[PDB]
Amino acid sequence: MENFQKVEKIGEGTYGVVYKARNKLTGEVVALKKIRTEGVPSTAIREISLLKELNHPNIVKLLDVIHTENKLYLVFEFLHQDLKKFMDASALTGIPLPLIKSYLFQLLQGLAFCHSHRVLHRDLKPQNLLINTEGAIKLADFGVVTLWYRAPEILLGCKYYSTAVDIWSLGCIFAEMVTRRALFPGDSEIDQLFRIFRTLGTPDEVVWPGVTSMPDYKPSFPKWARQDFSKVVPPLDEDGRSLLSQMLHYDPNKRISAKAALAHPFFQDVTKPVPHLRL
Q: Does 73 bind ligand AQG (CB under 6 A)?
A: no
Rule CB under 6 A: choose which of 58, 102, 128, 192 binds ligand AQG: 128
In the 8-state DSSP scheme, what is residue 224?
P
Q: Does 58 bind ligand AQG (CB under 6 A)?
A: no
CA dist 266 to 131, 229, 244, 260, 269, Å? 22, 16, 10, 12, 8
Residue closer to ligand AQG by CB (options 126, 240) is: 126
Q: How far is the CB of 58 from ligand AQG (least distance, A)?
A: 13
Query: What gap in Å lies between CA 168 and CA 225, rounded to an integer?
Result: 20
The DSSP secondary structure of 47-99, one letter per residue, reads HHHHTTS---TTB--EEEEEEETTEEEEEEE--SEEHHHHHHTTTTT---HHH
Q: Does 60 bind ligand AQG (CB under 6 A)?
A: yes
Write the CB contacts of 261 (distance below 8 Å, at least 6 apart in sequence).
108, 167, 243, 246, 247
Chain residues 26-55 in contact with ligand AQG, contact rule CB under 6 A: 31
Residue closer to ligand AQG by CB (options 147, 233) is: 147
Q: How far is the CB of 275 from ligand AQG (least distance, A)?
A: 13
Residue 19 φ then ψ, to 5°: -120, 145
Size of the site for ligand AQG (CB under 6 A): 18
Q: Does 252 bind ligand AQG (CB under 6 A)?
A: no
User: Any idea which residues carry the catalytic annotation?
Assistant: 123
The residues of the shown chain that bind ligand AQG, judged by CB under 6 A, are 10-11, 13, 18, 31, 60, 76, 78-82, 85, 127-128, 130, 140-141
